[PDB]
Short mmCIF file of C-alpha atoms and ligand atoms in Angstrom, two decimals:
data_model
loop_
_atom_site.label_atom_id
_atom_site.label_comp_id
_atom_site.label_asym_id
_atom_site.label_seq_id
_atom_site.Cartn_x
_atom_site.Cartn_y
_atom_site.Cartn_z
CA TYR A 1 18.53 -6.58 14.41
CA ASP A 2 16.80 -8.82 11.83
CA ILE A 3 17.12 -7.27 8.36
CA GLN A 4 14.64 -9.77 6.82
CA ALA A 5 11.84 -9.38 9.45
CA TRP A 6 10.03 -6.67 7.49
CA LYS A 7 8.74 -9.15 4.91
CA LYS A 8 6.51 -11.24 7.24
CA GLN A 9 5.52 -8.00 9.03
CA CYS A 10 4.34 -6.64 5.66
CA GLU A 11 2.50 -9.88 4.82
CA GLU A 12 0.64 -9.67 8.15
CA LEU A 13 -0.21 -5.99 7.62
CA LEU A 14 -1.49 -6.78 4.07
CA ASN A 15 -3.68 -9.54 5.59
CA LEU A 16 -5.17 -6.96 8.04
CA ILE A 17 -5.74 -4.51 5.18
CA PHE A 18 -7.55 -7.18 3.11
CA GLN A 19 -9.90 -7.90 6.11
CA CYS A 20 -10.67 -4.19 6.48
CA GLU A 21 -13.89 -3.21 4.64
CA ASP A 22 -12.24 0.10 3.66
CA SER A 23 -9.83 -1.81 1.36
CA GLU A 24 -12.60 -3.14 -0.96
CA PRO A 25 -12.15 -0.55 -3.80
CA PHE A 26 -8.39 -1.13 -3.74
CA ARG A 27 -8.03 -4.93 -3.57
CA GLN A 28 -7.69 -5.42 -7.34
CA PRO A 29 -6.67 -3.14 -10.24
CA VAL A 30 -9.25 -0.40 -11.07
CA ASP A 31 -11.67 -1.79 -13.72
CA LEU A 32 -11.47 0.28 -16.91
CA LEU A 33 -15.01 -0.74 -17.90
CA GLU A 34 -16.22 0.82 -14.57
CA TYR A 35 -13.96 3.96 -14.96
CA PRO A 36 -13.34 4.46 -18.69
CA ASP A 37 -11.24 7.59 -18.31
CA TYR A 38 -9.03 6.20 -15.51
CA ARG A 39 -5.78 6.04 -17.54
CA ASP A 40 -6.32 9.63 -18.81
CA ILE A 41 -5.94 10.77 -15.13
CA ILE A 42 -3.72 8.05 -13.56
CA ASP A 43 -0.31 7.21 -15.03
CA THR A 44 0.58 4.32 -12.73
CA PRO A 45 -2.23 2.14 -11.44
CA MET A 46 -1.61 0.29 -8.18
CA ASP A 47 -3.68 -1.95 -5.93
CA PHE A 48 -3.19 -4.24 -2.90
CA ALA A 49 -3.22 -7.55 -4.82
CA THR A 50 -0.36 -6.24 -7.01
CA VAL A 51 1.53 -5.17 -3.84
CA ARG A 52 1.00 -8.61 -2.23
CA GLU A 53 2.03 -10.40 -5.47
CA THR A 54 5.20 -8.27 -5.76
CA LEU A 55 6.10 -9.05 -2.14
CA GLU A 56 5.40 -12.80 -2.49
CA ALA A 57 7.43 -12.98 -5.71
CA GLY A 58 10.48 -11.65 -3.84
CA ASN A 59 10.36 -8.46 -5.90
CA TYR A 60 10.63 -5.91 -3.07
CA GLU A 61 14.10 -5.36 -1.60
CA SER A 62 12.95 -3.24 1.35
CA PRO A 63 9.74 -2.14 3.11
CA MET A 64 10.37 1.40 1.72
CA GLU A 65 9.66 0.07 -1.80
CA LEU A 66 6.41 -1.57 -0.59
CA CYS A 67 5.50 1.70 1.15
CA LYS A 68 5.99 3.67 -2.01
CA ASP A 69 3.55 1.40 -3.90
CA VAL A 70 0.92 1.44 -1.08
CA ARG A 71 1.17 5.27 -0.99
CA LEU A 72 0.59 5.29 -4.76
CA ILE A 73 -2.75 3.47 -4.19
CA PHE A 74 -3.79 6.39 -1.98
CA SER A 75 -2.43 9.21 -4.17
CA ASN A 76 -4.19 7.68 -7.22
CA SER A 77 -7.49 7.71 -5.32
CA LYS A 78 -6.93 11.35 -4.29
CA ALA A 79 -6.09 12.34 -7.88
CA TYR A 80 -9.10 10.50 -9.37
CA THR A 81 -11.73 11.63 -6.89
CA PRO A 82 -14.22 14.20 -8.18
CA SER A 83 -14.74 15.39 -4.57
CA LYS A 84 -12.91 15.33 -1.23
CA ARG A 85 -16.26 13.99 0.17
CA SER A 86 -16.51 10.94 -2.18
CA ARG A 87 -17.15 7.50 -0.69
CA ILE A 88 -14.07 5.77 -2.17
CA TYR A 89 -11.71 8.68 -1.37
CA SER A 90 -13.03 8.80 2.22
CA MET A 91 -12.30 5.05 2.52
CA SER A 92 -8.78 5.67 1.17
CA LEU A 93 -8.08 8.28 3.89
CA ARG A 94 -9.07 5.96 6.73
CA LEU A 95 -7.14 3.07 5.24
CA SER A 96 -4.09 5.33 4.75
CA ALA A 97 -4.21 6.36 8.45
CA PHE A 98 -4.39 2.66 9.46
CA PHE A 99 -1.52 1.74 7.10
CA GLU A 100 0.74 4.62 8.25
CA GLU A 101 0.08 3.76 11.92
CA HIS A 102 1.21 0.15 11.34
CA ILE A 103 4.08 0.63 8.83
CA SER A 104 5.94 3.12 11.03
CA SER A 105 7.56 0.45 13.27
CA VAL A 106 8.30 -1.78 10.24
CA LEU A 107 10.29 0.98 8.56
CA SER A 108 12.01 2.03 11.79
CA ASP A 109 13.04 -1.53 12.69
CA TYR A 110 14.32 -2.22 9.18
CA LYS A 111 16.38 1.01 8.95
CA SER A 112 17.81 0.40 12.45
CA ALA A 113 18.73 -3.22 11.59
CA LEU A 114 20.39 -2.10 8.35
CA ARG A 115 22.35 0.62 10.18
CA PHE A 116 23.50 -2.05 12.70
CA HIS A 117 24.50 -4.35 9.83
CA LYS A 118 26.63 -1.63 8.22
CA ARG A 119 28.17 -0.30 11.49
C1 K0J B 1 -11.06 2.71 -7.15
C2 K0J B 1 -11.13 3.80 -8.23
N1 K0J B 1 -11.90 4.95 -7.78
C3 K0J B 1 -11.32 5.90 -6.97
O1 K0J B 1 -10.16 5.90 -6.57
C4 K0J B 1 -12.24 6.97 -6.59
C5 K0J B 1 -13.56 7.07 -7.02
N2 K0J B 1 -14.07 8.14 -6.30
N3 K0J B 1 -13.12 8.68 -5.46
N4 K0J B 1 -12.01 8.00 -5.63
#
């Protein structure tokens, strides 16, 4: 029933993602000195510290908005990878599976609570 519960649930999931070794390439914005052509390929950079900062600033209204930005971290990795076998892309796929497995109940509980609120 709690329409605000998603926020702490997302904070806890972000904490788990930061402890996961697979999140290392995605914890901070991609370094342009490391990947000089990054902005020629990626229009909208995204990373987990930016997601956490947006959440802590009170700049997400719903967990769907947070989801959209986390999914953008993974689609940017898929678009930038030179190979479906690359180390960083392979890390992104495992981390995406872990994220999707955990965000499912957050989204469901939020949408259910909002439907109850507007009944
Ligand atoms: C963190 C920026 N690099 C990537 O997303 C990447 C590199 N190889 N495969 N994907």
